[PDB]
């Protein structure tokens, strides 16, 4: 329960930031429309700045996507781990051939959740080492 | 792959080295600017508002580097844990006794990684605000 609360809070923080990003992109969309309507000097210069600012927001949105997926995966993993801890309260000799292979299937699900998670951390690592430009 | 992971580790060790050096250069500019602020480098310098301005830019640039150093720390630990995890998983996916203990070591490694991701998230979502 204390594990699951620190997670809900991180999810809200992320939502709140995606909402702020959406809105900042909405303002840039409108300035962008006005600048392009004005293309019937300083005006061409504004168009390039808007492109930069939209780019920045997209990079920020991307990071939030990654964090939000990683968070979904922590949740799935935690639940699979619960399903597995429950099954391991019973000694192994007291289980069927079938019961034992469901334990092995749960464990595979959990390992491929972990693999996806590590793949998203590697991508985020790449992005943070690339943003030092 | 163990060599993907190796390569990512070398990248990180090398970026920490570039960071340590960028901080060394900033230490030196910082020392010169402060010698100039105490009127020791040129009798005009101390009156120039560009000089006070440099001091504040150095502080910002030092702060940026420390944020970067922090991120590299986290990534490097995470990477060690990814390595440990993948090896414990390999040990386990070979065996299928100490089988139940290996699984527990791996679940603790997974929990520590969750925890470093959460810390990284907190810091990245505080560099904005």
Numbering used by the authors:
A (entry chain A): 1841 to 1880, 1891 to 1983
B (entry chain B): 1843 to 1938, 1951 to 1983
Pull verbatim passages from the article behind this deposition.
Rab proteins, the biggest subfamily within the superfamily of small GTPases, are major regulators of vesicular trafficking in eukaryotic cells.
In order to understand the mode of interaction of Rab proteins and the C-terminal Rab-binding domain of Micals/EHBPs, we first aimed at determining the structure of the RBD of one member of these families. Interactions between the monomers mainly occur via two hydrophobic patches and some additional charged interactions. The dimer observed in the asymmetric unit is formed mostly by hydrophobic interactions involving the same hydrophobic patches in both monomers, and α-helices 2 and 3 from each monomer form a central 4-stranded coiled-coil. Interestingly, the Rab-binding interface in Mical-cL has a substantial overlap with the dimer interface observed in the structure of Mical-3 above. Additionally, even though all Mical constructs used have a similar molecular weight of ~18 kDa, whereas Mical-1 runs as an apparent monomer in aSEC and binding of a Rab protein induces a clear shift to higher molecular weight, both Mical-3 and Mical-cL run as apparent dimers in aSEC and binding of a Rab protein disrupts the dimer, thus not leading to a shift in retention time upon complex formation.
